[PDB]
């Protein structure tokens, strides 16, 4: 069972420098007197790592509390331990560290190691209550206070302890590397006696492999398991803990790095070099030796990657007579519909959506958000004053009086149905009966068919002969549009837009995103559909009025005409080149010089 401790209070982070450590055997092969280059997850040289006291006394009173934050686990972790009295005991791994996601424990008592992955319920301060015996004291008893409960256990492993016993300055360094790739939880280990060095010692030490585990879980966050020698019920004034946590543990974060490892005739890594540190090391990696002679070598290449984007594209003056339809005065009757044609215009569909004024927004065949992007060939517009409960019947694949008798909607409908009301504008106190609606027809219609005939339908067997009477009715009845009618009986201004997507030239297109102009900076540019990377400079060339572009002798674009501003701009590809290192023999000096071929010294 877990016992609550005091707050961590978010102690400030502290940094130190790691000098050539974390070098572990990257594979399981034997190499003798050879230089091998490996690209994998490692600790950078002279990298800056975060170090925590096991116990800190930060309060003015002298409160002894642990430095046990839960730290992020990204692409492996290097964990160093300078310790003397066996106070760090294990590690927790997972994503949530709760009863929601599977979590892994490694713990080390005096006898063996225990490794599990289950559904643990983890407390805020897991720890191990460690106490000595009253007679022997040779070993210690550990009471686990790490998790509340465990379920769905999927692995178990017990073997020789990872940490050796430490039972007055023989502090030792345990260097560990933990990685997770392809369901593989790998631990590489090494221990070394240290003397009179508070931080990591300077030197090299190969880290041998210790175990691989097929846990196969997702792990993003981890914590450090530590041991209470004291009592949480009665915290002593001082010395109840272990020398106020002089024992320390260091955390470094691994990255994909390249290393040149030198295997000797033993197959022990006696030296390594990282290729990304400094140009001297880059030269050593590219030449595949630890010593370079006096001369000049070429290591890599730079390209000056662009920093932003620009797009310009001309906008036509006239837009559309959308306001002639949507904001019209008089509308058509439902028996004699008003199709309107829209072509050779730029259609602003952001206006209709941002209007936040139309009740129904249902576009079929085209997503609502993308009307301005893609454009079409021809547009047909209809907009009417239909009753409210007859709104849902304008979408293809439907049944209803209007949906069956008046106007068919083909299933393969690419377009939009967008509706709202017309109460304050199309209703009158005496009722607006100028809209005539059909309820009787001889047969159902076809998609996009129009009938305006006013023939009297024969409900019975005798012919009407255009004259009403028994079993004879006029085709059209008028609606009682009143401002006091209920929601369904209200007048409803509904719009149907039918678009044409054909293998034909496009005459209607959407609004075009045009941005600001940037000069003398490498940028990705899109002029009238031409996309590229370059730096745009003011050009003296003169274009004839009907010309737009310019090419060199070698079929490469070099000059362009800005559509909005009639200036003429020329393009230079963004400066790149090779990088060379001038260096004398490594046996004489370790300083180098860099030379960038065929570029100007401003972009560097």
């Amino acid at each position, epitope marked *: 069972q877990c016992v609550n401790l005091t707050t961590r209070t978010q102690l400030p982070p502290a940094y130190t420098n790691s000098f050539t450590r974390g070098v572990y055997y990257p594979d399981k092969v034997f190499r003798s007197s050879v230089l091998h280059s490996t690209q994998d997850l490692f600790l950078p040289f002279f990298s800056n790592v975060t170090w925590f006291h096991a116990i800190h006394v930060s309060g003015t009173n002298g409160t002894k509390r642990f430095d046990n934050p839960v730290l992020p686990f990204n692409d492996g972790v290097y964990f160093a331990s300078t310790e003397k009295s066996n106070i760090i005991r294990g590690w927790i791994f997972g994503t949530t560290l709760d009863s929601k996601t599977q979590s892994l424990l490694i713990v080390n008592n005096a006898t063996n190691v225990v490794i599990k992955v289950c559904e643990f319920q983890f407390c805020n301060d897991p720890f191990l209550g460690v106490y000595y015996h009253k007679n022997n004291k040779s070993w210690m008893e550990s009471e686990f206070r790490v998790y509340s409960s465990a379920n769905n256990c999927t692995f178990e492993y017990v073997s020789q302890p990872f940490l050796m016993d430490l039972e007055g300055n023989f502090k030792n360094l345990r260097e560990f590397v933990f990685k997770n790739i392809d369901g593989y939880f790998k631990i590489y280990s090494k221990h070394t006696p240290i003397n009179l060095v508070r931080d990591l010692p300077q030197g090299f030490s190969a880290l041998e492999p210790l175990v691989d585990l097929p846990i196969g879980i997702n792990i993003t966050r981890f914590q450090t398991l530590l041991a209470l020698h004291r009592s949480y019920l009665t915290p002593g004034d001082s010395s109840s803990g272990w020398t106020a946590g002089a024992a320390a543990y260091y955390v470094g974060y691994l990255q994909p790095r390249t290393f040149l490892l030198k295997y000797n005739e033993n197959g022990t890594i006696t030296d390594a070099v990282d290729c990304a540190l400094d140009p001297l090391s880059e030269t050593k990696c590219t030449l595949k030796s630890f010593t370079v002679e006096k001369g000049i070598y070429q290591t890599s290449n730079f390209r000056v990657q662009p920093t932003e984007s620009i797009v310009r594209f001309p906008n036509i003056t006239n837009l559309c007579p959308f306001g002639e339809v949507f904001n019209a005065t008089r509308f058509a009757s439902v028996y004699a519909w008003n199709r309107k044609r829209i072509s050779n215009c730029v259609a602003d569909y952001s206006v209709l959506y941002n209007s936040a004024s139309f009740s*129904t927004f249902k576009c079929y065949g085209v997503s609502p958000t993308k009307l301005n992007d893609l454009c079409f060939t021809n547009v047909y517009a209809d907009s009417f004053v239909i009753r409210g409960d007859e709104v849902r019947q304008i979408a293809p694949g439907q049944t209803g009086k209007i949906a069956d008798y008046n106007y068919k909607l083909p299933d393969d409908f690419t377009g939009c149905v967008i509706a709202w009301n017309s109460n304050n504008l199309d209703s009158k106190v005496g009722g607006n009966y100028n809209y005539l609606y059909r309820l009787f027809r001889k047969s159902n219609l076809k998609p996009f068919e129009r009938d305006i005939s006013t023939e009297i339908y024969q409900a019975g067997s005798t012919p009407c002969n255009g004259v009403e009477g028994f079993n004879c009715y006029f085709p059209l009845q008028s609606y009682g549009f009143q401002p006091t009618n209920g*929601v369904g009986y209200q007048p409803y201004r509904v719009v149907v837009l039918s678009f044409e997507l054909l293998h034909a030239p496009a005459t209607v297109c959407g609004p075009k995103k045009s941005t600001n102009l940037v000069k003398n900076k490498c940028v990705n540019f899109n002029f009238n559909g031409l996309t590229g990377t370059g730096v745009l400079t003011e050009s003296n060339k003169k274009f004839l009025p009907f010309q737009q572009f310019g090419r060199d002798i070698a079929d490469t674009t070099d000059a362009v005409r800005d559509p909005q501003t009639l200036e003429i701009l020329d393009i230079t590809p963004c400066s790149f080149g090779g990088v060379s290192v001038i260096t004398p023999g490594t046996n004489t000096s370790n300083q180098v010089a860099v030379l960038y071929q065929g570029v100007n010294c401003t972009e560097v």
Partner: nanobody
Amino acid sequence: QVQLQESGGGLVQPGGSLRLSCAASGFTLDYYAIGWFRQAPGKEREGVSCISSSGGRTNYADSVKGRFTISRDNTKNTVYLQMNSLKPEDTAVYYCAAWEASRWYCPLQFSADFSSWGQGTQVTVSS
């Protein structure tokens, strides 16, 4: 396939509390504002409480202020309300309407078209 469904109606005591929810299937409800309306026996359908598409703008009738709380979850696509201290004047049929505002403003004070309507549920307060 646009469908609106009520959940949580029933019989309670005056002064009590209950929670009603409108769920929906066939389309997403984050774009729509959703209002709650009620029809009393012999009375017209009144506006009980409206909430915007993003939930930042809300409307309560003067008779329902301080007892009703409207809310929505756009992630799971439902709209909730909590009524406390119920009265016999609140027993009626109850509806959820999802639509888009019709005028140039952010609030939802006024009424407009009521795009999609569920079948409703009965809320009864009597003791």
